[PDB]
Amino acid sequence: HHHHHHMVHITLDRNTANSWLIISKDRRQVRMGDTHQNVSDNKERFSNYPMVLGAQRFSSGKMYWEVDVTQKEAWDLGVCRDSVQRKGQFSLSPENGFWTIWLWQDSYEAGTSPQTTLHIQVPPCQIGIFVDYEAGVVSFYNITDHGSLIYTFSECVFAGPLRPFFNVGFNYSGGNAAPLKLCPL
Ligand SMILES: C[C@@H](NS(C)(=O)=O)c1ccccc1Cl
């Protein structure tokens, strides 16, 4: 791909984070804590899952960023509507306002309803995410494999401002403590 020139500097929004997340001082890294991180509750926080949003809101244009997923066993990445549900149980789908891919139990899948199997020959250590608001496109790229395409959601019905979306995943196994990191431009 040649989308690199639409690079945007994403930072994480502490106020949206699940209460067990630890966001770095620079707001560019997030990981699972081993307990509640001693914050007040609020209506923005994802309650059921280890999720957080970027601070940036996008309603037009072309945007690109990259995320480091090195040595994680489970995560979700993409974009979502600013108005997505925060509390209780929900599935990641375009009907619920999410355009995402994930790693879970040694397979990669796109968050369609029902989910779509991804075909990745080189397990990625860094993921590129491209959003074209006007075109209704969200695309995912394998930076480890020379930028190869992972998945394109097209005919997207955003229906509102978009936010970068992250899930560090559970760490029941003791093998998923590593952070998500926003990679430098
Ligand atoms: C299960 C728990 N911690 S962990 C490290 O994954 O065992 C958790 C932490 C944050 C949100 C939901 C849940 Cl369920």
Tab-separated table of C-alpha atoms and ligand atoms in Angstrom:
chain	number	residue	atom	x	y	z
A	1	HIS	CA	0.000	0.000	0.000
A	2	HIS	CA	0.958	3.733	-0.378
A	3	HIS	CA	-1.340	5.078	2.494
A	4	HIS	CA	1.600	6.040	4.843
A	5	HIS	CA	1.316	9.822	3.913
A	6	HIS	CA	-2.192	9.980	5.616
A	7	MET	CA	-0.419	9.135	8.929
A	8	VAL	CA	-2.156	10.642	12.025
A	9	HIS	CA	-0.754	10.818	15.612
A	10	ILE	CA	-3.223	8.831	17.751
A	11	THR	CA	-3.314	9.092	21.561
A	12	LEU	CA	-5.420	7.023	23.968
A	13	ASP	CA	-8.335	8.538	25.943
A	14	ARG	CA	-7.899	7.500	29.667
A	15	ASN	CA	-11.553	8.386	30.401
A	16	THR	CA	-12.843	5.646	28.033
A	17	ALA	CA	-10.548	2.886	29.376
A	18	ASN	CA	-11.722	-0.148	31.290
A	19	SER	CA	-10.689	0.409	34.927
A	20	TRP	CA	-7.998	-2.361	34.811
A	21	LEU	CA	-6.047	-0.751	31.938
A	22	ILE	CA	-2.712	1.081	32.391
A	23	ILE	CA	-2.052	3.777	29.787
A	24	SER	CA	1.501	5.120	29.520
A	25	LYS	CA	2.368	8.799	30.308
A	26	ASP	CA	2.719	9.561	26.544
A	27	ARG	CA	-0.810	8.033	25.943
A	28	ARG	CA	0.727	5.796	23.214
A	29	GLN	CA	0.796	2.382	25.040
A	30	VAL	CA	-1.833	0.374	26.958
A	31	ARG	CA	-1.689	-2.931	28.848
A	32	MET	CA	-3.791	-5.060	31.217
A	33	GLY	CA	-3.160	-4.443	34.900
A	34	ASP	CA	-3.363	-7.352	37.390
A	35	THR	CA	-6.089	-5.368	39.374
A	36	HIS	CA	-8.432	-2.291	39.301
A	37	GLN	CA	-6.240	0.779	38.592
A	38	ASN	CA	-7.875	3.013	41.283
A	39	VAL	CA	-9.887	5.326	38.972
A	40	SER	CA	-13.527	6.528	39.440
A	41	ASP	CA	-16.226	4.961	37.242
A	42	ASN	CA	-17.913	7.036	34.486
A	43	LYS	CA	-20.409	6.445	31.656
A	44	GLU	CA	-17.598	6.374	28.984
A	45	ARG	CA	-15.622	3.370	30.393
A	46	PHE	CA	-15.940	-0.025	28.713
A	47	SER	CA	-17.117	-2.173	31.702
A	48	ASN	CA	-16.980	-5.829	30.470
A	49	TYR	CA	-13.823	-5.977	28.295
A	50	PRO	CA	-10.249	-4.496	28.342
A	51	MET	CA	-11.122	-1.817	25.719
A	52	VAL	CA	-10.135	1.838	25.209
A	53	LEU	CA	-10.676	4.490	22.483
A	54	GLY	CA	-8.334	6.955	20.856
A	55	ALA	CA	-8.956	10.632	21.736
A	56	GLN	CA	-9.167	11.633	18.043
A	57	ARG	CA	-12.586	11.815	16.298
A	58	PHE	CA	-12.768	11.526	12.474
A	59	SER	CA	-15.798	12.634	10.355
A	60	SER	CA	-14.018	13.162	6.954
A	61	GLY	CA	-10.815	12.394	5.004
A	62	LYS	CA	-8.227	9.646	4.908
A	63	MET	CA	-6.392	8.536	8.098
A	64	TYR	CA	-3.660	5.892	8.691
A	65	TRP	CA	-1.970	4.630	11.870
A	66	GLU	CA	0.062	1.553	13.021
A	67	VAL	CA	-0.163	-0.613	16.146
A	68	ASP	CA	2.469	-3.000	17.615
A	69	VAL	CA	0.980	-6.374	18.736
A	70	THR	CA	4.326	-8.199	19.408
A	71	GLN	CA	3.977	-11.406	21.508
A	72	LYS	CA	0.241	-10.987	22.265
A	73	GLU	CA	-2.086	-14.004	22.156
A	74	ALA	CA	-5.358	-12.014	21.883
A	75	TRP	CA	-6.428	-8.436	20.862
A	76	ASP	CA	-8.997	-6.531	18.799
A	77	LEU	CA	-8.103	-3.458	16.615
A	78	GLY	CA	-9.902	-1.068	14.306
A	79	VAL	CA	-12.388	1.854	14.526
A	80	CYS	CA	-15.817	2.343	15.991
A	81	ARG	CA	-18.603	4.919	16.169
A	82	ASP	CA	-18.307	7.466	18.979
A	83	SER	CA	-21.827	6.284	20.126
A	84	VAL	CA	-21.013	2.530	20.630
A	85	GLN	CA	-22.387	0.810	23.738
A	86	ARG	CA	-19.881	0.911	26.682
A	87	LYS	CA	-21.678	-1.231	29.361
A	88	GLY	CA	-22.588	-4.914	29.366
A	89	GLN	CA	-22.112	-7.630	26.771
A	90	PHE	CA	-22.002	-6.976	23.004
A	91	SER	CA	-20.421	-8.435	19.826
A	92	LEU	CA	-18.012	-6.546	17.570
A	93	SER	CA	-19.944	-6.058	14.297
A	94	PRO	CA	-20.696	-3.252	11.845
A	95	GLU	CA	-24.368	-3.433	12.997
A	96	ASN	CA	-23.143	-2.464	16.525
A	97	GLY	CA	-20.800	0.272	15.164
A	98	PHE	CA	-17.416	-1.547	14.992
A	99	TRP	CA	-15.015	-2.214	12.072
A	100	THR	CA	-12.371	-4.509	13.607
A	101	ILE	CA	-10.086	-7.557	13.198
A	102	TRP	CA	-8.788	-9.754	15.999
A	103	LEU	CA	-6.451	-12.526	17.095
A	104	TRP	CA	-8.000	-15.245	19.300
A	105	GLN	CA	-6.843	-18.860	19.959
A	106	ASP	CA	-4.246	-18.885	17.203
A	107	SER	CA	-6.625	-17.611	14.433
A	108	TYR	CA	-7.184	-14.155	12.907
A	109	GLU	CA	-10.794	-13.098	12.077
A	110	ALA	CA	-12.605	-9.965	10.848
A	111	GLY	CA	-15.471	-8.689	13.062
A	112	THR	CA	-18.314	-9.272	10.603
A	113	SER	CA	-21.567	-10.970	11.752
A	114	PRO	CA	-20.863	-13.790	11.620
A	115	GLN	CA	-17.045	-13.435	11.781
A	116	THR	CA	-14.848	-13.977	8.701
A	117	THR	CA	-11.690	-16.153	8.655
A	118	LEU	CA	-8.497	-14.220	7.692
A	119	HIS	CA	-5.648	-15.874	5.697
A	120	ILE	CA	-2.328	-14.606	7.147
A	121	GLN	CA	0.889	-16.552	6.247
A	122	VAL	CA	3.237	-14.250	8.299
A	123	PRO	CA	1.864	-13.574	11.849
A	124	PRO	CA	1.978	-9.768	12.159
A	125	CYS	CA	4.014	-7.902	14.821
A	126	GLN	CA	2.596	-4.524	13.564
A	127	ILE	CA	-0.805	-3.766	11.929
A	128	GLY	CA	-1.589	-0.731	9.702
A	129	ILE	CA	-5.171	0.672	9.804
A	130	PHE	CA	-6.477	2.852	6.946
A	131	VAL	CA	-9.816	4.719	7.039
A	132	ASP	CA	-11.349	6.524	4.009
A	133	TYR	CA	-14.415	8.241	5.491
A	134	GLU	CA	-15.980	9.427	2.228
A	135	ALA	CA	-15.401	6.080	0.442
A	136	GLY	CA	-16.781	4.030	3.402
A	137	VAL	CA	-13.576	1.886	3.652
A	138	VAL	CA	-11.581	0.436	6.567
A	139	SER	CA	-8.493	-1.602	5.565
A	140	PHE	CA	-5.912	-3.548	7.575
A	141	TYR	CA	-2.313	-4.174	6.461
A	142	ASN	CA	0.428	-6.598	7.683
A	143	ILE	CA	3.492	-4.283	8.224
A	144	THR	CA	5.696	-7.384	9.081
A	145	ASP	CA	4.900	-8.816	5.555
A	146	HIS	CA	5.804	-5.705	3.429
A	147	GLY	CA	2.352	-4.105	3.968
A	148	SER	CA	0.281	-7.009	2.506
A	149	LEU	CA	-3.532	-6.624	2.721
A	150	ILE	CA	-5.253	-8.433	5.589
A	151	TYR	CA	-8.889	-7.314	5.177
A	152	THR	CA	-11.055	-4.496	3.650
A	153	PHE	CA	-14.495	-3.517	4.961
A	154	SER	CA	-16.244	-1.670	2.134
A	155	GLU	CA	-19.708	-0.103	1.830
A	156	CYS	CA	-19.273	0.914	5.497
A	157	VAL	CA	-22.193	2.846	7.041
A	158	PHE	CA	-20.210	4.829	9.699
A	159	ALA	CA	-23.318	6.863	10.702
A	160	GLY	CA	-21.312	9.172	12.987
A	161	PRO	CA	-17.838	10.304	14.011
A	162	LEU	CA	-15.249	7.481	14.233
A	163	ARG	CA	-12.742	6.758	17.005
A	164	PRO	CA	-9.676	4.463	16.962
A	165	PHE	CA	-10.611	1.286	18.884
A	166	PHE	CA	-8.372	-1.083	20.949
A	167	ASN	CA	-8.808	-4.238	23.025
A	168	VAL	CA	-5.657	-5.562	24.820
A	169	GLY	CA	-7.530	-8.841	25.574
A	170	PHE	CA	-7.871	-10.884	28.763
A	171	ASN	CA	-4.764	-12.433	30.402
A	172	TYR	CA	-6.254	-15.650	31.878
A	173	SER	CA	-3.303	-17.627	30.289
A	174	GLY	CA	-0.442	-15.523	31.711
A	175	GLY	CA	0.804	-15.243	28.075
A	176	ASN	CA	-1.064	-12.061	27.030
A	177	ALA	CA	0.324	-9.322	29.374
A	178	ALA	CA	2.212	-7.446	26.601
A	179	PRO	CA	0.975	-3.964	25.613
A	180	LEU	CA	-0.572	-2.549	22.443
A	181	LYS	CA	1.722	0.297	21.299
A	182	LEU	CA	1.011	3.076	18.776
A	183	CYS	CA	4.102	3.091	16.483
A	184	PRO	CA	5.910	6.278	15.471
A	185	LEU	CA	5.344	7.982	12.078
B	1	LIG	C1	-10.613	-11.169	33.605
B	1	LIG	C2	-10.115	-9.824	34.104
B	1	LIG	N1	-8.633	-9.835	34.109
B	1	LIG	S1	-7.733	-10.931	33.322
B	1	LIG	C3	-6.078	-10.369	33.445
B	1	LIG	O1	-8.098	-10.897	31.936
B	1	LIG	O2	-7.816	-12.167	34.049
B	1	LIG	C4	-10.732	-8.600	33.366
B	1	LIG	C5	-10.062	-7.378	33.305
B	1	LIG	C6	-10.617	-6.287	32.658
B	1	LIG	C7	-11.855	-6.384	32.068
B	1	LIG	C8	-12.546	-7.568	32.117
B	1	LIG	C9	-11.988	-8.658	32.767
B	1	LIG	CL1	-12.913	-10.137	32.800
